[PDB]
Design an enzyme around this catalytic site. Structure first.
Site, PDB file in Angstrom:
ATOM      1  N   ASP A  60      -6.120  -2.430   5.127  1.00 41.73           N
ATOM      2  CA  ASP A  60      -7.193  -3.314   4.696  1.00 41.73           C
ATOM      3  C   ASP A  60      -8.089  -2.636   3.673  1.00 41.73           C
ATOM      4  OD1 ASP A  60      -8.974  -5.401   4.463  1.00 41.73           O
ATOM      5  OD2 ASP A  60      -9.828  -5.184   6.469  1.00 41.73           O
ATOM      6  N   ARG A 107       8.187  -1.499 -14.597  1.00 39.93           N
ATOM      7  CA  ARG A 107       6.928  -2.203 -14.779  1.00 39.93           C
ATOM      8  C   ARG A 107       6.017  -1.405 -15.703  1.00 39.93           C
ATOM      9  NH1 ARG A 107       6.504  -2.679  -8.288  1.00 39.93           N
ATOM     10  NH2 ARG A 107       8.081  -4.324  -8.039  1.00 39.93           N
ATOM     11  N   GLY A 154       0.766  -1.230   0.000  1.00 40.32           N
ATOM     12  CA  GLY A 154       0.000   0.000   0.000  1.00 40.32           C
ATOM     13  C   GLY A 154       0.802   1.288   0.000  1.00 40.32           C
ATOM     14  N   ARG A 194      -0.447  -8.659 -10.566  1.00 36.97           N
ATOM     15  CA  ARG A 194       0.349  -7.973 -11.575  1.00 36.97           C
ATOM     16  C   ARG A 194       1.461  -8.865 -12.083  1.00 36.97           C
ATOM     17  NH1 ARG A 194       5.029  -6.111  -8.167  1.00 36.97           N
ATOM     18  NH2 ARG A 194       4.168  -4.758  -6.535  1.00 36.97           N
ATOM     19  N   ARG A 252      11.169 -11.540  -2.287  1.00 33.98           N
ATOM     20  CA  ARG A 252      10.310 -10.450  -1.839  1.00 33.98           C
ATOM     21  C   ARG A 252       9.428 -10.874  -0.681  1.00 33.98           C
ATOM     22  NH1 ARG A 252       9.326  -6.038  -5.159  1.00 33.98           N
ATOM     23  NH2 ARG A 252      10.885  -5.812  -6.818  1.00 33.98           N
ATOM     24  N   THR A 291       0.915   3.234  -3.511  1.00 31.92           N
ATOM     25  CA  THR A 291      -0.403   3.720  -3.914  1.00 31.92           C
ATOM     26  C   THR A 291      -0.858   4.876  -3.031  1.00 31.92           C
ATOM     27  OG1 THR A 291      -1.015   1.506  -4.719  1.00 31.92           O
ATOM     28  CG2 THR A 291      -2.812   3.057  -4.238  1.00 31.92           C
TER      29      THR A 291
HETATM   30  N1  LIG Z   1      16.668   1.571   0.758  1.00 26.67           N
HETATM   31  C1  LIG Z   1      15.913   1.975  -0.286  1.00 26.67           C
HETATM   32  N2  LIG Z   1      14.851   1.236  -0.667  1.00 26.67           N
HETATM   33  C2  LIG Z   1      14.114   1.648  -1.724  1.00 26.67           C
HETATM   34  C3  LIG Z   1      14.420   2.814  -2.418  1.00 26.67           C
HETATM   35  N3  LIG Z   1      13.484   2.952  -3.410  1.00 26.67           N
HETATM   36  C4  LIG Z   1      12.652   1.885  -3.322  1.00 26.67           C
HETATM   37  N4  LIG Z   1      13.052   1.105  -2.306  1.00 26.67           N
HETATM   38  C5  LIG Z   1      12.369  -0.069  -1.763  1.00 26.67           C
HETATM   39  O1  LIG Z   1      12.706  -1.242  -2.432  1.00 26.67           O
HETATM   40  C6  LIG Z   1      11.612  -2.192  -2.282  1.00 26.67           C
HETATM   41  C7  LIG Z   1      11.303  -2.757  -3.640  1.00 26.67           C
HETATM   42  O2  LIG Z   1      10.676  -1.781  -4.478  1.00 26.67           O
HETATM   43  P1  LIG Z   1       9.934  -2.236  -5.810  1.00 26.67           P
HETATM   44  O3  LIG Z   1      10.964  -2.973  -6.649  1.00 26.67           O
HETATM   45  O4  LIG Z   1       8.809  -3.165  -5.400  1.00 26.67           O
HETATM   46  O5  LIG Z   1       9.463  -0.951  -6.424  1.00 26.67           O
HETATM   47  C8  LIG Z   1      10.455  -1.420  -1.638  1.00 26.67           C
HETATM   48  O6  LIG Z   1      10.406  -1.661  -0.224  1.00 26.67           O
HETATM   49  C9  LIG Z   1      10.853   0.030  -1.871  1.00 26.67           C
HETATM   50  O7  LIG Z   1      10.302   0.938  -0.936  1.00 26.67           O
HETATM   51  C10 LIG Z   1      15.510   3.559  -1.986  1.00 26.67           C
HETATM   52  O8  LIG Z   1      15.840   4.648  -2.538  1.00 26.67           O
HETATM   53  N5  LIG Z   1      16.218   3.111  -0.933  1.00 26.67           N
END
Ligand SMILES: Nc1nc2c(ncn2[C@@H]2O[C@H](COP(=O)(O)O)[C@@H](O)[C@H]2O)c(=O)[nH]1
Length: 194
Positions: free
Chosen positions: A173, A45, A17, A138, A149, A20
């Site tokens: 929720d 994506r 969440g 997705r 993940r 979003t």
């Molecule tokens: N440490 C860190 N985590 C990040 C950063 N940008 C995205 N993430 C985290 O990496 C995870 C994977 O992100 P996703 O690939 O699903 O977009 C998520 O928990 C997201 O918040 C960042 O700049 N620094």
């Protein structure tokens, strides 16, 4: 840069969440908040936009900027590199806006070691089972990545109750309810910005 208002760090499992809800907040309160655009080496994506959701760069490019000292923090997550560049936060502070960062648990701990002094908010799914259903809809990940993940999500949920880690933990929720609670946590900062 310590000037400008106090930043906000959003965390919790990806897909539960936080992203979003942040997009909704930036639409309703676009004059008050600005988003830190992280760099990532993962592939975009469908529907994501470079320079809005992330700066999508290769490992080689990100490594050059890391070596130059361009990053506040960075983390390895599910096979890819992510990080908050100095300029990403400075761009928002220059507009005198509240900078919102979306990072994983490693990023929370990284930022705790900096001088930024943000408010920390965690957005949780109702269960890991619900999160898995949402991620498989997705279906943007290989099975190997989904396994990494889901393990990271479990670790995130376990750490969310750690005393002093988060100022507020929101259980998502219903998006409308979680969004009301995100603004609740920021209500004093919103009123002061106005
Ligand atoms: N440490 C860190 N985590 C990040 C950063 N940008 C995205 N993430 C985290 O990496 C995870 C994977 O992100 P996703 O690939 O699903 O977009 C998520 O928990 C997201 O918040 C960042 O700049 N620094």
């Amino acid at each position: 840069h310590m000037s400008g208002p106090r930043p906000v760090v959003l965390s919790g499992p990806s897909g539960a969440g936080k992203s979003t809800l942040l997009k909704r907040l930036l639409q309703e309160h676009s004059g008050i908040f600005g988003f830190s655009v992280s760099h990532t080496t993962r592939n975009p994506r469908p529907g994501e936009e470079n320079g809005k959701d992330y700066y999508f760069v290769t490992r080689e490019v990100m490594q050059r900027d890391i070596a130059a000292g361009d990053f506040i923090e960075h983390a390895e997550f599910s096979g890819n590199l992510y990080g908050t560049s100095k300029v990403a936060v400075q761009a928002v502070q220059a507009m005198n806006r509240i900078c919102v960062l979306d990072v994983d648990l490693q990023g929370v701990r990284n930022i705790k070691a900096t001088d930024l002094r943000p408010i920390y908010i965690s957005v949780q799914p109702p269960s890991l089972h619900v999160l898995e259903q949402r991620l498989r809809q997705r279906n943007t990940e290989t099975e190997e990545s989904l396994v990494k993940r889901l393990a990271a999500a479990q670790a995130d949920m376990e750490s969310s109750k750690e005393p002093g880690l988060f100022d507020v933990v929101i259980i998502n929720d219903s998006l409308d309810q979680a969004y009301a609670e995100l603004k609740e946590a920021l209500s004093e900062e919103i009123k002061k910005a106005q």
